[PDB]
Structures are given as C-alpha cells and as structure tokens.
Ligand binder design. Structure first.
Ligand SMILES: *C(CCC(=O)O)CC[C@H](*)CCC(=O)O
Ligand SMILES: *C(CCC(=O)O)CC[C@H](*)CCC(=O)O
Ligand SMILES: *C(CCC(=O)O)CC[C@H](*)CCC(=O)O
Ligand SMILES: *[C@H](CCC(=O)O)CC[C@@H](*)CCC(=O)O
Ligand SMILES: *[C@H](CCC(=O)O)CC[C@@H](*)CCC(=O)O
Ligand SMILES: *[C@H](CCC(=O)O)CC[C@@H](*)CCC(=O)O
Ligand SMILES: [Mg+2]
Ligand SMILES: [Mg+2]
Ligand SMILES: [Mg+2]
Ligand SMILES: [Mg+2]
Ligand SMILES: [Mg+2]
Ligand SMILES: [Mg+2]
Lengths: 319, 319, 319, 319, 319, 319
C-alpha cells in the first residue's frame, strides 16, 4: 500500500517534495584580522583559510558580498596580549579598525563581531584568570566595554563566544545605555567544550590555552542543560542563539528550533572543516559533495544561519 | 529589553533570518488541453491562461522545463460529453495523447494528471448522476479505469480532484493491479465547496454545473473535518495531499503540515488568480508583487507544492 | 466503513455539524473621516468605500448600528501634515471630533480608534523619520499622547497599527496614568509588510510613502516571528491581538488562537477587497458569494473580530 | 497591567469577543410517537412534552421545521411488548409509520431514529434478558434489523442508545449490506448509568425497568473510560458521537471534542428538563433564562448537536 | 476483541476500576449568619437551607464537624446596609462574631469567609457603585480591609466572590502586611454571570440587584477567558481557585485541573439545589440519587472541594 | 540568580550531573570478511580497518568479546559477482561460513548480518537492476532468502541496509516461516543518499556503483520523511531501527528516540572515520579525543547502539 520510493523515482519529484534547501542567505563568513598592511597568511591547519590584514579584508568583503553573502564574523588577533585584556576595548584596536574600514567600503554587509577575551590574554581563556579560576562577573564587565567598542566602530551584531553566565543580559544593558539598542546580539548560547576547536586556536595564534575549558563550556554529554542555557539567554534578550560545534551537535539544534521561536545559528567549526579537507587531500572523500551535504544537514536540523569557513566556496556553487 | 526590529534593520539581516523562501521547485503549472492541431485559445476570465493543442502543449512544456519547472498538471477538454463519461478512460483520448506526446518530448518533467469526471459529463459534476444524486462508488469505479488509463499513457502522478469517499485506496488498488505501483497519487484531500472556481469552470467549458457541489465538497466552515478527510486519504496511501482552495485556506494547510508528516500540496485557484489580474488592470494593485507575496504566504503556511497559473511568470522572476 | 459524505448528504445535516458560523457580532466597520461638512467621497480604488465628513459619519454610524454592528475603527485624514505629526494628539483634531460626535449620537457603539502617524506626516510612515530611519522610541512617545487624546474624546478602544517595539506597554502605562485603565487596546500584533495595502494608502491621501516599511513591518515569509511578536504584546497588556493582512494570512491566525487564550482579530484589507470588487466588475466571480465565503474562512481560522469594508453589506445579508 | 473587565465593559464589547453562540442549527427535537389517530397526551413528569399520534407528529414537524429546526429524534411507543422485542423491526410498526409519514410531508428535515429495545420489551431494559442478564450479541443482532427497518422506512440517521459492545460496527455492516451506506449513525458513545432519566421512563410508558442498568451503562465516576468507549465507536464508523446525560457531564463533552475530530452530540435529559420546569413553577428560577444558559453551556463545552425537549421554545427565541 | 462491559459485569468489578469516589473530605458547608439570638429561618426558595443566628451556627458547626465536615463558608447578613459598605470591615460585625464564636467552640474546623460587598450595600452589587458603574479599584480597597477583618476574628481562609480585577493579589498584600501570611485565599477565579443564583439572593435578603452583573462576571459562553482569569489569580498567589456555577460548568473545571497544578474548588449553586428539590417535591426525580450523582460528577470533572448546601445530607450518607 | 557554571566548577560536580555516558555495551564492531585463509588486508581509505579471512575473523572476535564488545556486524566480499546476486543466499557462501565459524568459537557474542545486494552484484547497487531501474519487490524476494540463509548459518540478528520498500515486513514473514521467529531485525530505517560512504565502498571492493542511489536512499534534506520511513518499519516489526549516516544526522536520531519507543541504532560511517583519521595524521586534531567525543555525541542524541569502526579502540579506553 505505502511505497515511499514513489517520491524518489525521479529528480523531477525529489525537488518538488524536498523539505529543505540551502541558500546563500544562510551563510556567514568568519574573518580573522591580523595587524599589518598587504599580507595574507594561510592557516597551516585550515587549508583555504587565511589571516587578513585590514586592507585585504576590505577587498575580501567585496568578493564575499558580490557572491551574495550577507554577514561576516570578525575575529581579532592583537599585537599585544595582556593579562587584563584591555586591548579588547581599545578604540584603535585592529578589530575596531576592521569594522570601521569594512563598513565604509561595503555598507550593505552585516558585520558581526566576536566578543571574547581568548586571543587578547596570555592564558588563552575566554575570561580573566586569577588563581587558576576563570572569573565570571569580572570578565563580563570587560565584555561589556568590548561590545560597546564594536558598536562604536559601526558593528551591526555582536557575537559573544565567552560562555560566561549572564553576559548577554549585561551586554544588552551595556549596549542600551550607550545608544546602541539597535545593535543586535548573537549569543553563543550552547557552546560545548569540544576537541574540535584545534585548527581555530592556532589560526588566532592564541597563547597556550593552559587548562581545559570545562569550568564554563558545556559537557558534550548534555542535552537538557543546553535547553536551560538557551532560555536564560532569550530571557536576557538575545536576538539570535547559536549552538556550537555543528555537525555532531545537530540534535541540540533541532531541540532549540522546535522550542524557542527564535532564529537559530550554528558553527561549522575548524575541526570539522579540517576533517573534510584532510580526507579529500588523501582522495578518500569528495570535498565539494561532503561540504555541501553537511551544510544541508544543518538546514535540515533547523539552523537558519551557518558560520562556515566554506561559505565563499558554498556561495560560488549556489550562484 | 526585547527589540524585534533588530532583525529587520537591514536587508542583510532580513535575508539571514528569513524563515521561508519561494523556489522554482515549489511550482506546478496546470495545463489545459483541447482537441485540434496548432491552436491557443486564451481564457476570457483568466487573462494569461490558455487552452492548448497537444502540439502547442509540448511547445509550452519545453519552455516550462527550461525555466526550471519540475511538474505539470494536465486537464483535458473532450470533443464529446457522455452521461457515463466513458471518454475519460479512452486510450486515444486527448488527455492520453497529451501525456504520451509530452512524455516523449520532455521526459525529465513530472506529468501529473487530473482524475475527475467534471469536463467529461454533461451534468458538470465530478461524478455520475442518477436521480439528482452524484453517485459515490459508481463514480470511483470509473475513476479507477481513468487513473489506469493515464498511467498507461505514461503519467507519473495522478491527481484525483473528485472528492468521492475512499477513491484513493481504490485507485491505489487499481494502479497496483495494472503494474503501476510506481505511479503516485496526489490526493485533493481537503477540497472545499468554494465559489472561487468560476474562471476554471468556463476554461474547461464544462457544461452547466447544475446545483452546487456541497454534497461532496467540504463546507468552507469546517476545520476539524479536513483533519478527518486527510487522515483517511493517507491511510489509503496518498503520497501527497492537497488543500483547495489556497489563499483563504492557509490555516488548513498549516494544520495538515503540523500533524501528518506527508508532503503538502495546495491549489492557487482561478478565482484568486483572476482577482489579482482584474485589480491590477485597474492599477489598484501591483500584479508581480501580490502574486509573489501570495505564493510566499503558501510556503510559509507549510506547503511544498503549489499548483499555480502564475507558475511560468514566477519561474521567470526566480531565474 | 468510513463515509464522510454522510454529513453532507443534505442541507439539514450540513447545518447541524457546521463547526463555525459568521454573525454580525464578528464585524467591525472601518471609517475614514475627512474634514468639512456634508461631503462623502468614494475611494476610486475601493468601490463602495467612502471618505466621511463628521456629520455624515454620525449618520452612517446610525445605519451601521441599526444593522447590528457593534464596533467601528476610526481613521483620520488631517488638513495639515507635519514632520513632527503633532496634529495626531490635537484635541480639536478631526478624528477627536468624530469620536466625540459619534459617542454622543450612538452611545451603544464601540469606538475603536487608529493609533498611527501614517496619514499625519509628509513621509507617509507609521513613525517619525530622522536620517531615513523610522524611529522607535521617539514615535511611541507621540503614540502615547495620541491614544490619550482618543480616550479623552471618549473612545472605547485604541488600535495601534504602527508596528513599533513596546508601544502597547507604553500606551497601557500612558492610558493608566491618565485615568483610562478602562479604555482597551487592540494591538496590531503581527502586521506584515504587504503589497495588499495599496487602495488604503490612496484612501487616506497619505503623501508618498517613500521607502518601503520593511524596517518594522513583518517579513511575509515568517511564522515563528509572529508568535514572538504576539506574546510580547500580551505580556505588555493587550486585550485583543490582530493579524494583518487577512485572507492569505489565515495560518498565522490559527497559530495565534491555538496558543494565546486571547480574543483574535483580523483585517480584511483594502487589496483583498479591491480584488473581489474588480473581478466581479468583469463578471468572473460572484461578489456576494466570495465576500461571505472569505469572511467565513476567517471565522474558521479562529478569528473573533473582522475589520472589513464589506461589514455593512455583510450585516445586511445576516439580518 | 491586566484588566479582563475591559472586554466586559459594554454589550458592544461582550458580543464581539463572545467565544461561543447558540443557533437553531444546534438543536434536535426528540419526538414521542404513540399508536392511534389524533391524540396528544402530555407527560406528567415533563410539562411541555407530549405523546403524539403519527398525524399530529407530522403537524408538529411542519411547525418545527418552519421555526428552523433541522433534525428530529423519533421514539416509538408500541401497543404490544414482547420478550423477543420483534415489534422493533416490524415494517408496519408505529415508529416506521411515523418515519414514512414525516418524510413525505416535511422532506427537508433530518429524521434520526432511536435504536433501542427499551420500550419494546416488558423487562424495560435496552437489550434481551435471559437469566437476569441483559445479553449483548443477541441484542445487537436484533438492533441490526431494527436499524435496517428504519432506513427502509426512510430514516436519515439512526441513533442507537443501547450501550451494547460493538453494536455500531455491526449496525454499519448491516446498513451497508442493505444498500443504506448513505444512512448515518449517531452513537450514544458515552451513555451513563444516570438517575436523571426518570421523566423519560414514564413518558414512553416502558414497563418496570427492573434492576438498574449498571451492567452496560457507564459509571458516573468514570472519565478515562468515556475516552475508551468513544474511540471504539469511531473506529467502528460512527459519524456523530454523543455524551449522555448533558449538563452534569460537560467535562466529558469537552474531552471528546478536544481529542476525536468528529461532530459531538449531547442529550439534554428529561431530568434536567423537569428540574428547570419544577423550580420555575415555584418562582425560584427564571425558566427562559436557565434553559437558554444551560444550552449555551453545552455549546461552550464544545457540542455541535443538542438533543433537547426545549428545542421548539429555544427556536422561537432565536428566531 | 474489545468488550468494555467486562468491567461492569458485577458490583465487585465496578468498585475496583472506579476512577473517582466522593468523600466527606470533599465537602464544604455554606452558612448564612443573620443577627439575633436563638432563631433559625428556612429559606423559602431553598428548602432544607437555613439562616442562622450566631449561637445556632455554633451548634450547627458541632453537628457538621461530628459528621466529618472539614470546612465551612460563612456569609453575613447585616442589620444595616450602607452605600459605602463599611459594615463589611466592622470588627463587631455579625460575620466577625460568628468566626470568633465558631473558632472558640469548634477549633478543628476550617472557617472560610466570603469577601464580597453584595449583601452589605443597597445596590446589591459585589462592589461600590458610582454613576451606575461598579468600581474596580475602589472596591478592592474595601475588600482588602474586609479580608483583614476576617483574619483578625480568627478565620482560616478568605473566599472573595467579588470578581474584581487583581483583588487576589491586593488581598494577599493586605493579609501579608497585617501578620496573616498564614491565612489562605480561595479565589472565585471563574465566576460566571449566571441565572442560577436566584435562591441565594433572597436567602441573604440582599436588596434589589438593580442592573445585571455582566460588567465583571464572566460570559456563560466563554471557555478561553476562564483560563486567562485563573492564571492571573495563581500568579497573584491564590492557594485554591474556584469555578462557579457547578453542574453546567464541569468543562471549565476539567480545563482548570488539567492545566494549573493547584487544588480545584466548585460551587453547587442555589439554583441547581432548588432544581433538584422542586422536582423531587413533584415526585419526578429521586432527590438522594440526583444530589449524590451530581456531587460525584464534580469529583469526576476534577474538583477537590465542593461548596454545597447538601453537604450535611451528603455527610450523613457517606458515614 | 541563575549560575549554570556551578555544575561545572569541578570534575566532581560535572560527573554527578552528567546526563549521558558512553559504555562498551553501546558498541557494535563491523567486520569485513573476504575469501581465503590467513590473510588481513588493510583498507587504504580506512586506516585501522581490515579485510579478514574467516579464520582471522574468529581471532578478531575473541579479542573483541574479551574487551567487552557484545555485537558484530558482518559484511561479505564474494569471489564472484552475478547479475542475479544468487551467491547472497548460498549456504556455503563466505558470509555464511564466517557466521558458522564465529558462532562456534565465541557463542556469547551477538552476530548481526548485513542484508544487501551491494557487494554481490556487478552494478554496485543494493538491489537488482533491469533497464537502469533498481527493482524493489524483485530485490526483496532475494533479500528474504538471504536473511533466511544467515539465520540458517546461526546469525542472531539481520541488519537489512537495502532501503527497499516493505522489505522488513517480508523478511519478518520469511524468517517466521522458516522457524526463525527468534532471530531479530535491525532495520536501516532512515538511510540517506550520502557522499560519506566512499571509504566503505572500496573496502568491500563493490564494482562500479554506477549512477547515484537517490531513487531509494533518502534525501539528506528530509526530516519529516525519516519519521514516515521509521514508522512503516516499526509497524512491519523491526526490533531495532537505525539512522545512517551518524554525526551529521543526530537530529534524526533525536526525533526517532523521542517518538518511537524502540531501541535506536546509528552508523558511524567510513567517511566520518576517515575524516578523523586523515586530520589526525596531519596533527590538526587529536584522534582519541575526537573519536570519543563524537561517540558521546551519539549517545546524547539518544542512540543505544553504535556501529563504529573505532569500536575496538573505544573498548580499550573504556576498559
Ligand atoms: C476542483 C474544481 C472543479 C470544478 O468545480 O470545476 C478541481 C480543479 C481545481 C481548479 C481550481 C481553479 O482553478 O478554480
Ligand atoms: C437512554 C435512557 C433509556 C432509559 O433509561 O429509559 C436513551 C434515551 C435518553 C433520554 C434521556 C432523557 O430524556 O432522560
Ligand atoms: C549503506 C551503504 C552502502 C553503499 O553505498 O556502499 C549500508 C552500509 C553502511 C556503511 C557506512 C560506511 O561505513 O560508509
Ligand atoms: C569558541 C571556541 C574557542 C576555542 O576554544 O578556540 C569561539 C570561536 C569558535 C570557532 C572555533 C572553530 O572554528 O573550531
Ligand atoms: C496598516 C497598513 C498601513 C499602510 O501601509 O497603508 C494600517 C491600516 C491597515 C489597513 C490597510 C488596508 O485596508 O489595506
Ligand atoms: C456569587 C454570586 C452572587 C449572586 O449573584 O448572588 C457569590 C455567592 C455564590 C453562591 C450563589 C448560589 O448559591 O447560587
Ligand atoms: Mg550561558
Ligand atoms: Mg476523501
Ligand atoms: Mg510588536
Ligand atoms: Mg460502546
Ligand atoms: Mg479575576
Ligand atoms: Mg523503509
């Protein structure tokens, strides 16, 4: 009686019933900005990924937008790393310059900016360290000024990847106070303590991360705790809530979409990206096929936004 | 605290968070075929719609598929109308000739065929009439042969618009018996007794429709009864289920999608089409914008397939 | 075994099981009030619709109530349009006079009043414009005084169609402060950026609307975002929540009714009205049948109140 | 913040927000028919209710339909009572004569017929008795013939009040076999062992009811068991399901409507009717107001059809 | 296969599976206290009901508790009725004396006290009347002092039957402020504007109730609005929430129990009581059977507490 | 108020609250068997994976079970490939020899056997090919015999990976007929048309896979269709249901577990395995940590059984 294969008999039927499709409007391109002029350094552990000087990020953002990419996520690599991480909220900071430069050149592009102290401190942590303890409230107060700093330079969205308690609310208070109630917050609501973050940590040159990040980042075994975490951020006022990492976390994505009535974002992490890249170099997989299939998997799971290092290559195929 | 306008501040942000999108793959173009060679009669009450000869129907389907449309829905206008409606299951019938011709020329296109006795009988009803009563089981037995007839001509899908009880299960049985278990059924599961079908009625020249069709077509006031209708049709083995009419019935479309786990189809009826067309001719509305917005509304309501007479125009804009 | 057609066999059975019915108590008549004495101007793009002088609105409200209509929605057309839109909260305003006059003549009628700056400003926007940006908070403070102004003149309900963030709460604070805790608020909770608003914009003579209204009005593709929008307004204290537009938005209506335990209102928009009117002028549809069927569709979708320009014609048929 | 009294401040507002309404189309009038010509005996325990002769029953039905009542429920009082209850399926039985006479005179009225052995047997039970045991399957086999008998006389619906297991499926089978698959079944799905049926019992003169009917009629303490009872009856093929008694059973009515997607019917029992009637005669209550409020309560509980002895009085007021 | 009658075959099986049972712990006895010494007046419209002088209420409360009744609801009939209703919060009031006397004699009994201005004012309303408008906030401030007055005299629970907005919260604030955070509140959360309250209004001799109570008491047609009403009272801090009236409102009771995780109370109103009493006087029903069946109906619907005038007669049978 | 980091402050607290854990009992080791004696060929595209001879397969299973692995999944590589794939049901086939040998040596281990025609046919598809069409019912009839063949050799479970319609029910029928109603079925219920199966394909040497397998394997874009697929398979009688591929499909795994009440299995595909393996060889990721985290992710998604090529390595670490 029931033969499901009827909806798969032809390409002309599979497209009709196809529940989900990937578009360029689902893609956000992360951009690493280092100091200097006219230099582009390839990440050794992320083939195809690059460190960009401000002038080169500007031109990259032209190519990105012309391909139809709507948003970018900016990551800063400072020349000086300090224990108090005060360079994070420097108005003359490399990140701040990048925002200001890109907003001038490509105004129609949405500039999302990372709000974390990870590459701004010698300990390699998202927050301030005292006696081996990564502090909560002391960090958030630094995070407040950082988000203000980004909004000041002209940023559209701030994306705090710190995983501190109640930072989203404080940042909302901080941004509202400084005439930026129109600058949005993409919370990294359920960021897990993953072993998939390798290639990202050498890409930002962040100094030895010391002890692991299990004091604040989620236990990879937990599902219910992600639901608690996301809700707190929505009550705090987050416009968009993200789950990280991506591929092996598509179950959390589904739970967040089915339950919260808020745009869902996902991170196609460096490790996932390096996995596809290394296996294709050996000839064991097809890079193009796996990268696109995995991006469609994220759309099926219920993600609306995908922060991916394959965004530009994905943009070219969806033209 | 909460400012939803943040996700509306720029075209860049609106596109990232946009929950639903319209594609060429959500469109099916209904096609009316009349007897003769090389003639295209425009429908008076549907500007832009045409009665096609088998040879010019082929011409249209080349143009349709090249624009990226995956499926068509065929309607036949027979030279002769009989009380027993036997021409419906004629193997040399115009409908059958059109299927066989289109399938030869453009094989990669999905041919869906209307299974109803409306234009084949002088009484203008979907079934066989006796003493003013439109008969159920006697009709289905004729419909069984009709559906088999289409499959024999080369049809991919059959779309029974009759609204007789238990027709789908019997058609499934009849199709399975004649080695066509790979031919699908798109059921008009919740088809309503609407006054929006005016322009469709004179388009197929169907003879005096007599009294209304409230004895079998659903009461426009009923919601819970659409759920009952759809289920029976799924248990019977429908691959796709349809809600008709479209615009003013998007609540039913949403109920069907949230409850049944089966591809949902919808009909953008001739009345809706003529309504946009007549108001645009006066300059009171923008044709392109209203037609596209109404199509987006249907995707939002949770439809996957849209039977629309604007399909080709919409395809041109999404190209 | 199961033959649903049994409940459709006769008119005497269809009425018994009929899930929903339209009554006069479901209808609200929108009224446009222009300055002057003894003048009634027909809207060129809305046949059957009229611009009313105060003395003529009074007499119209007699005919409306005598037919059994319980509520009216007042729209003002001022002689002077100012960039600050201060005429909106003028106690001697044409809208205010209308409220005061109608309340004297027909006390038993519920006067709902529009709270938006659309026809009161040269830019044709629901709010105040600065550097091309339609302001949020600055607008709401003007909206506060406007609602107070209406309540002062004797209005029963205020219906803010502005689509600003947090206006409903502020208006509730504003009305509570000025001894009007008994004057209700019908929020336009999920008003979409539609291309169906044409004939309404020329009816209020509102000056060229400049750029589109996508910064605040909802994306026609969004369903989940409407659920977020409605809830915020209910927490803010809205007595009634409306979805706009109507016919092609019946899915949102269903979601709002099934989830919020609050009276649901809907807007039968000018474009929908002009569509039925233009097609009937051509003879392609039956005006009476389509207008009533579409009103029943709204009752089926779960609406309690219908703001419709066919209200009086609908009232006459339901007598 | 929240003031619900805002929607109660005026008759104009109460009517707009009113969730449910009572219509003539929700009313079915039960009619008792006795042997003889031209005689109307008033029931002592039901003031306003009458025993009717076939000829005066016709007279009543003209008056009923002209007031707008769509359906009647017929009860027969036979001249002779036999232990095998064979008069129930007599083709010249008074019930059958009444069906055939009413259907000729007022054809546009829906005739529903009681299928029970209560007034046809000396033991006063719904089924056949053996050794003090009211038999199940032996009863249903008699009920099958009874239902067929009514269909043969011209009945539109059969309403089996017996509360035997699996009776509906068998009646459906029996009706389908005898070319009556178009005749519906209104099942007394959750009929309770109530003490409210006093005035109904002497009205049909049913001989000494013996011991109570707790062996088959539901325990007034059971909720979950009504859900079990109703489902079996729907799977068996009931078109409408009924809850009995009415007023004190509105919770069951709500459970049935929220869970089953099938038209729900209810019985306004003789005891409820006599209760209002006796208290009004003392001047302790207002008859008109209580009868109407109780009918509104049933519509609110989610019933669509109401079997009530006040049907004609209610029809007069809704006219 | 499935024969439900198996669980009804014997009394020894019906008791095992019986889902719900009525106990004495489900019963609360309402008590009307008039001024004077050694006098008991029978309510003409409520046979079996009595007006009690303080000394006679004390002795009645002995008989009530000895039968196993845990709670009583006290209603006051003052010698003087004033427009400001200041006698309501008089420490020397007849109600206050009753509380104090009964608490001395039967300490183990739970004294619940009515908090409404109905029999304390000449207009016969639950609140203070100004220009025909029954005031909200002005009433609640009087209600605050009334509840304090009751708690002062030694009351256990206060049961506000006023149906004013936000009274439960204010009374909670008022009781908390005056060292009575341990005195509970049984809110009349969803009290409907019923025509069943007749015999209660003459029992308290309350002066002509003037215009009806539709400005604050619920529309008998509304279900969703009861859900909104109950929640507000639970957020305000109500320990117990009641639905009124009882029998014809068992659907609201079910909705309240299934959704709110809070003890549910119900009122077996005077009109329901007078209905059973009048019909039994005629011999049409069995008083004992109907009274107990209807009390079990309330337990089935999900009520925990039943305010009933048959409580003592019910207590005697459940001994 | 809320600080989730409290449950992350120490390893002592993280372990107490940890929602999910990985055990040796959640692991199944897939085993490839080739013809010959005493030979172990390592897969070029899967480092760590091996082609085993029946005798060395036994050797492996001793080592596997001693580490605590409860189940294995056997794949056969036949010396000869025929178009009818008859070697699949050969009783002296290598697969059958391996079952019979392993079951003798290590009896306490659960032998699960792959039921597919992929490595047995030159066309490289799961079913029989005719005119470019992979046949359904003709395939299942061969699969029936195959499953019976395994049961005859001594298999405990059969795991059909074919993705033909209605194969499970027929296999259940076929197994029950041949006195093997105690042999289970682990259905590949939602197997997707993935590009992750590269390294598995050359491992079993399966001849040119021809065109893709989108005619029967699920579209990676479909969520609702996995729910439809799984249900049919459960109604057919599957004891365990599987989702494939794994990591990028954890949303489907969660949907299946939350809805179906049947043990959920998952496949850690060769592509995922090669991805971790290739990236670790470059030193971009930690092999041990990523492999274990991905396995934990699967347990979190709600899987109970995990088919993984890292099973033995994982078993060593959990020892
Ligand atoms: C139903 C209508 C048949 C009829 O009444 O003629 C099947 C075809 C639907 C077409 C919709 C339209 O374009 O009106
Ligand atoms: C059930 C009652 C039969 C009986 O016990 O006599 C079927 C008829 C219901 C009538 C309800 C009433 O009016 O009491
Ligand atoms: C499905 C894949 C068959 C094929 O396409 O060769 C059944 C076996 C799954 C193995 C998964 C893997 O390791 O790739
Ligand atoms: C979160 C993780 C920081 C770290 O531990 O390196 C902030 C940035 C996420 C992207 C990581 C990736 O691409 O893997
Ligand atoms: C909302 C839309 C304003 C506009 O854009 O014109 C306020 C009034 C709604 C009615 C519009 C209609 O009737 O189409
Ligand atoms: C609510 C109703 C007051 C009234 O209108 O009389 C407070 C007391 C309820 C009991 C009424 C009854 O027993 O009917
Ligand atoms: Mg957090
Ligand atoms: Mg059907
Ligand atoms: Mg809003
Ligand atoms: Mg039954
Ligand atoms: Mg209240
Ligand atoms: Mg399957």
């Amino acid at each position: 009686v029931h033969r499901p294969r009827r909806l798969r008999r032809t390409a002309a039927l599979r497209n009709l019933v196809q529940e989900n499709t990937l578009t360029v409007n689902d893609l956000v391109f992360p951009l690493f900005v280092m100091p200097g002029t006219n230099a582009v350094e390839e990440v050794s552990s992320m083939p195809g990924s690059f460190r960009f000087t401000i002038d080169r990020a500007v031109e990259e953002c032209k190519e990105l937008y012309d391909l139809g990419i709507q948003g970018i996520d900016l990551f800063g690599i400072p020349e000086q790393k300090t224990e108090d991480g005060s360079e994070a909220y420097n108005d003359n900071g490399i990140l701040q310059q990048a925002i200001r430069a890109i907003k001038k050149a490509v105004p129609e592009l949405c500039i999302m900016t990372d709000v974390a102290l990870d590459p701004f401190t010698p300990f390699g942590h998202d927050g301030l360290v005292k006696d081996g303890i990564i502090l909560n409230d002391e960090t958030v107060e630094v995070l407040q000024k950082m988000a203000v700093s980004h909004a000041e330079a002209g940023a559209d969205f701030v994306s705090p990847s710190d995983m501190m308690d109640g930072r989203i609310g404080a940042i909302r208070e901080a941004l509202d106070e400084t005439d930026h109630s129109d600058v949005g917050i993409l919370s990294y609501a359920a960021k897990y303590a993953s072993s998939f973050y390798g290639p990202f940590r050498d890409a930002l040159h962040s100094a030895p991360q010391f002890g692991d990040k299990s004091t604040y980042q989620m236990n990879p075994a937990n599902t219910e705790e992600a639901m608690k975490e996301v809700e707190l951020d929505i009550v705090e006022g987050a416009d968009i809530v993200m789950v990280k990492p991506g591929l092996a976390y598509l179950d959390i994505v589904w739970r967040t979409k089915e339950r919260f009535d808020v745009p869902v974002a996902i991170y196609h992490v460096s490790g996932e990206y390096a996995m596809v890249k290394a296996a294709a170099a050996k000839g064991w997989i097809d890079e193009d096929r796996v990268m696109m299939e995995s991006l469609l998997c994220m759309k099926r799971a219920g993600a609306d936004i995908i922060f991916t290092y394959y965004a530009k290559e994905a943009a070219k195929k969806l033209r």
